[PDB]
Amino acid sequence: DDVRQYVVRKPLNKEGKKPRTKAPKIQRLVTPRVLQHKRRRIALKKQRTK
RNA sequence: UACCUGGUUGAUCCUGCCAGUAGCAUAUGCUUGUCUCAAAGAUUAAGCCAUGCAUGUCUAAGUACGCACGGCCGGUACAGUG
């Protein structure tokens, strides 16, 4: 299950400022970039063996 | 530029040093218009030190929920600057 729909967002409201919400960047989140990095590492291993 | 000169005697020839002579380094005195370089708290005390400064550092690429700013949509995980 994804965790992006449970990140605690803090509401921001300041005197004279438009209100908004803030969420942190989720660490150790498996993302396509992470899998691509893992696959590139595996491909480098393949290339070295060959 | 491989150079000497005065001084021992009544006079002479010597040994011989003293004193002259030129540079170079520090100091000092007097004087000083232009211009280019340029040493400089070593010598005595590696003595003692008020104060300020002399060592900091971020890229697309470690960690950004500081509205501290801030949007080409804001249920956006993380826009961006930081």
Swiss-Prot record:
Q: List the disulfide bonds.
A: none
Q: What is this protein called?
A: Small ribosomal subunit protein eS6
Q: Could you tell me where this protein is found in the cell? A: Cytoplasm; Nucleus, Nucleolus
Q: What does this protein do?
A: Component of the 40S small ribosomal subunit. Plays an important role in controlling cell growth and proliferation through the selective translation of particular classes of mRNA. Part of the small subunit (SSU) processome, first precursor of the small eukaryotic ribosomal subunit.
Subunit structure and binding partners: Component of the small ribosomal subunit. Part of the small subunit (SSU) processome, composed of more than 70 proteins and the RNA chaperone small nucleolar RNA (snoRNA) U3.
Organism, scientific name? Homo sapiens (Human)
> PTM details?
Ribosomal protein S6 is the major substrate of protein kinases in eukaryote ribosomes. The phosphorylation is stimulated by growth factors, tumor promoting agents, and mitogens. It is dephosphorylated at growth arrest.
Q: Which domain of life is it from?
A: Eukaryota
As for family, the record states:
Belongs to the eukaryotic ribosomal protein eS6 family.
Q: What range of the parent protein does this fragment cover?
A: 151 to 200 of 249
